[PDB]
Design a protein around this ligand. Sequence first.
Ligand SMILES: NC(=O)C1=CN([C@@H]2O[C@H](COP(=O)(O)OP(=O)(O)OC[C@H]3O[C@@H](n4cnc5c(N)ncnc54)[C@H](OP(=O)(O)O)[C@@H]3O)[C@@H](O)[C@H]2O)C=CC1
Ligand SMILES: [Ca+2]
Length: 186
Amino acid sequence: VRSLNSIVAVCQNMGIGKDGNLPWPPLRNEYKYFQRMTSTSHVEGKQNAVIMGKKTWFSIPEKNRPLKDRINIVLSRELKEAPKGAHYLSKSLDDALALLDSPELKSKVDMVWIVGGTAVYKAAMEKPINHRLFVTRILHEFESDTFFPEIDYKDFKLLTEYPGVPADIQEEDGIQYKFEVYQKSV
Ligand SMILES: NC(=O)C1=CN([C@@H]2O[C@H](COP(=O)(O)OP(=O)(O)OC[C@H]3O[C@@H](n4cnc5c(N)ncnc54)[C@H](OP(=O)(O)O)[C@@H]3O)[C@@H](O)[C@H]2O)C=CC1
Ligand SMILES: [Ca+2]
């Protein structure tokens, strides 16, 4: 795979989850952003793939699984078979990458998105491959029990602009947030 993309929303404490769910109540516009960015393919006949850990898969309401219009790959060292509704099960990020490179997948897949959690982000960030990280920074603090790993600011450079990503601070439900894009070139 030529390049990876990761997307996450974090609060001021770098928190991403609390008790199996998000630390903050629902933000409609943030959700729409995730859906659009991960579902949009730049090529006809192809779809994007999303890779996620097991607790992230089960955090999605059952009736909404798998994430529509994307090939869903779940990572787990314990499961024997892909959970009901998932397209593929992999035992490491490396296996999932290999999978994608395979014949069947290769022609069917456009972009690859990493959608969490912690260990999934961390493994993707360590690969010496071109990578774009789409971060939503929610400018408030919420209690969290699961955090985003540290990003190497020497490697991942913050872009000042990116096509189709609003620059300004956004606000919804009395909460402000900003979209940032960081890029690592390999
Ligand atoms: N704010 C945001 O952007 C996001 C927030 N969330 C939140 O994060 C939490 C879920 O995240 P987290 O707790 O970190 O869990 P994960 O979703 O990463 O699930 C962890 C499990 O996934 C498997 N796994 C994870 N990484 C790997 C790997 N590299 N290779 C193989 N298996 C792997 C293992 O399963 P096994 O034990 O079976 O081996 C591990 O126990 C929830 O609160 C969710 O709501 C999630 C995504 C994005
Ligand atoms: Ca486990």
